[PDB]
Ligand binder design. Structure first.
Ligand SMILES: CNCc1cccc(-c2cccnc2)c1
Ligand SMILES: CNCc1cccc(-c2cccnc2)c1
Ligand SMILES: [Mg+2]
Ligand SMILES: [Mg+2]
Lengths: 546, 546
């Protein structure tokens, strides 16, 4: 039966209702009860407020009309308005107080996830106030979660006029009996009900949601915590910058405010940050989520030395130079974590702050060859297995789906020991042909990785592991320095390759290092514990990069 | 003979020299003459400063070494340092005082324009101070103008060590006698001279430039005012956003700070803003220079109504939604000017501020059809000529080079009257086959337009002119509103189509409108008077959009 759900903005998706500040203001100021509402509604379908709601005039033009109205109401009720009474002030304050009503948004999201078409239908105004940006931000955040946003001032019609409902129905490509409509004003529900829509009168949120649950047959209340918002690749702005003749870097870009450059690990993608990108943009950052060199839509030259840290870092500086960015905050995971530490040591003037997930900062040992260092840790055996050009490429390219499905697994789901890989003859030699799907990833998300890696395969990616000696010699140049810009290290309790204890000496080199630690989190940190990652990065960004 | 010119940063490309603050500080504080220089140089090739300049330690690690040095020098000279004496403070202040020495930069630019290879060779440090961004910005601004930037702390070598000069020569792919080297420290010149480089000792800038002129044989002093910096397309970050299934918008993006969306006119390109893009980014803005729908690398669907203002504006809102931008400053020229006024009237919550070049804001007349309004002005006759699908496309596509060469002309160069175009049978009927090249444009710049327009031709572009009735009906919805967000109108004295007097009533609708006016400027404003446009936009941005 029901296929569509329609929510109002004031008093339903957003609270406190701005309508409601008339009531509060009368109470706070000891005015005659309803005086401000009388003024707000004066003239009815031909008064100032209706012309505003229909888009005939803007909010700033309406303000002095309401003011006049407030005077007229107070004269006929034989009172005075307080010295300094200000409609502009009252409304600035109420529009900024009003916030997304999170449980109602999450119900709309869940219904949309079960197949509902969702819409916002609202009587609202053209906002040209000095502070309009606050409302623009609220609308942006809400509207990406709905199929349609219908605004009275854009369509020239207002609730309760019957034409707006017919316009709704026609927008929804739905008959009225397939629709549930929620509003906190009973007069606004009435024409929907006359057409045989299910309607819900919203006073407190929980009761409305109980009625909504009952009538749709879907669980909306007491539901577990949902995942952060993810990214749909074809909805992103995609950027491309040529950093030298055969090397162009692709990135996805969302948000405004301080530039934050996200650098993924092996064998990954910009898409590995899909849960961080909307959260960090929504927190007030300009996010640039890279395809690192060798991956996705970035160039992937075959030569091994094109992937040494020195070359990669110099390219990332060029990337900032071409974008006209004097700095970015650099956040990396895995190989990208290693990269951002080297950015901080060699280009601190370009790094506003630095954060790594999983990858520790360990100074090079000038008295031991890196390949021997590597041979000393049984869990890095797979790194020796990666050395010989063509061997790991053949195994990893042989069946991409099985490759990402076998790699991307939560800590309780493993099919790969990283144990004696060379001796085993490969990474997947004792893994199934058809792994089950991790709880972390959908089959669609796997096929996105699979399609990215069809372009250039694993040569470029593996090459990141093939510059151990060259990276060691470059790193030895930096052994006298410390990292003294703002820095965060995020350890993952159950990453059994990049273990939290490997980071334990970092304060000797980064004395003011901050930390976060994520329990029950494997190697694929951003997608294993996306909620916790987001919280830790935004806290650290707002305190240290701001 | 000479093919290459090498400049130092401190005291040559940038002034006052930070070295020089030791002198000034001793004088200001009544310290023993040379005390701070003695401390700065203590230990010579093995002291703190040399390790800094070679990249062994960072600036923040060096600060307390210099401090110690300052104490030791003052003890052996039997004096005290003042209470609150601060090396950090002295250096923060000196590094921010130091600015690009504009006449020396413009000499380097001019030599580069006559074929020199140019480089900056500098002893400098790894800057990890809280205020490092100021230096990062200076280096970014300078370095885009040179072939190479060689920094002591990146290469592990310092002037005057002879290896740094050999490294220079090898970088320049030049023998020493082809090179002129300028430095303000004679000891730093000596190894260059030993190799037979021409050297110039820089004290005052003018004298150095006279020697530079003499030895290169090129005029560098008293030279006319150069054009602002332009854009090279293959050096830009190129962005792409799908705003609906068959419509993706391309843009070029440079800079950080408030988003500024530049919207070009007919029949133009993002490249028409090539002189504004670096200037506005350099002024502290995030510039987004669009290919408008129908142009360049943006989609160009054939249908006429895809190009009505309502559809175009709704798309531009979607473009901001997908980029995660709650607002942008919108600056338009010509058709793009018309568009940004409609953005301000219909989406003021998304428009931080609005500026138009040439295009006035004239409310629709609800009592006259727009086509009759158009017939009333003899200079808009070419707009009737554009109505019939396929006619103007055939003339404008027939020879692209002749098309842009005939259109893009300064006010003293015209070959087109816009007079009785329909009756003439076309736009170019009485223009030459091979127009001369305008002073405004190079043959390379013309061929960039020609190559852009080979992708989709003139159908999409002309379609912008084919929605007069549809745009009029939409505009009539807005006749009750005023524009009350910050707004700038820039008139062009010699634009004989979009004449300055057409804007004379705009204050009735935009009572707080600001203005700029450009004399001796034709229709192609950004490329006719790029210096004046830049100055007018940056002044207005910094006061009204900031
Ligand atoms: C460590 N750099 C990325 C990488 C390379 C190879 C394997 C794994 C992996 C695979 C499974 C579990 N944990 C980690 C991770
Ligand atoms: C007015 N919209 C752009 C346009 C269209 C057609 C011709 C010209 C033009 C051509 C020459 C001189 N001045 C203006 C300009
Ligand atoms: Mg309501
Ligand atoms: Mg110098």
């Amino acid at each position: 039966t029901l296929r569509a759900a329609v929510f109002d903005l004031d008093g339903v998706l957003a609270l406190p209702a701005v309508f409601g500040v008339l009531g509060r203001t009368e109470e706070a100021l000891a005015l005659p009860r309803g005086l401000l509402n009388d003024a707000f509604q004066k003239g009815g379908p031909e008064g100032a407020t209706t012309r505003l709601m229909k888009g005939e005039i803007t909010l700033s033009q309406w303000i002095p009309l309401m003011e006049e109205n407030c005077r007229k109401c107070s004269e006929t009720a034989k009172v005075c308005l307080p010295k300094n009474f200000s409609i502009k002030e009252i409304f600035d304050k109420a529009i900024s107080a009003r916030k997304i009503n999170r449980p109602m948004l999450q119900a709309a999201l869940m219904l949309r996830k079960k197949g509902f078409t969702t819409a916002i239908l609202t009587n609202t105004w053209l906002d040209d106030r000095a502070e309009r940006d606050g409302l623009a931000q609220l609308m942006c955040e809400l509207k990406m979660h709905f199929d349609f946003l219908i605004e009275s001032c854009q369509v020239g019609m207002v609730k309760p006029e019957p034409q707006i409902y017919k316009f709704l129905l026609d927008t929804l490509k739905a008959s009225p009996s397939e629709v549930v409509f929620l509003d906190d004003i009973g007069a606004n529900l009435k024409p929907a009900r006359d057409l045989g829509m299910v309607t819900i009168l919203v006073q407190d949120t929980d009761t409305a949601l109980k009625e909504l649950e009952k009538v749709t047959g879907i669980q909306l209340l007491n539901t577990p915590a949902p995942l952060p918002t993810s990214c749909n690749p074809s909805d992103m702005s995609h950027g491309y910058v040529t950093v030298k003749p055969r090397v162009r870097l692709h990135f996805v870009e969302l948000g405004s405010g301080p530039a934050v450059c996200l650098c993924h690990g092996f064998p990954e993608s910009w898409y590995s940050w899909r849960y961080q990108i909307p959260a960090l943009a929504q927190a007030g950052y300009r996010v640039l989520a890279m395809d690192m060199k060798g991956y996705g839509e970035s160039s992937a030259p075959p030569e091994i030395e094109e992937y040494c840290m020195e070359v990669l870092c110099k390219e990332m500086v060029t990337f900032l130079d071409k974008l006209g960015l004097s700095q970015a905050v650099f956040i990396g995971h895995d190989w990208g974590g290693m990269l951002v530490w080297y950015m901080a040591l060699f280009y601190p003037e370009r790094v506003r702050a630095v954060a790594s997930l999983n990858t520790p900062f360990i100074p090079a040992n000038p008295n031991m060859s890196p390949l021997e260092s590597i041979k000393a840790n049984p869990v890095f055996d797979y790194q020796l297995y990666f050395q010989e050009p063509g061997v790991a490429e053949a195994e990893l390219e042989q069946n991409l789906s099985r490759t990402f499905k076998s790699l991307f697994r939560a800590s309780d789901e493993s099919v790969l020991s990283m144990h004696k890989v060379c001796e085993a003859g490969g990474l997947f030699v004792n893994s199934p042909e058809e792994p089950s799907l991790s709880r972390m990833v959908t089959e669609e998300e796997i096929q996105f990785y699979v399609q990215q890696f069809k372009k250039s395969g694993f040569r470029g990616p593996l090459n990141w592991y093939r510059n151990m000696e060259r990276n060691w010699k470059w790193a030895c140049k930096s052994l006298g320095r410390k990292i003294l810009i703002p820095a965060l290290m995020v350890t993952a309790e159950k990453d059994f390759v990049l273990v939290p204890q490997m980071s334990q000496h970092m304060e000797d080199w980064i004395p003011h290092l901050k930390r976060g630690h994520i329990e029950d989190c494997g190697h694929w940190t951003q997608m294993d514990k996306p909620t916790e990652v987001n919280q830790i990065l935004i806290k650290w960004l707002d305190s240290d990069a701001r």
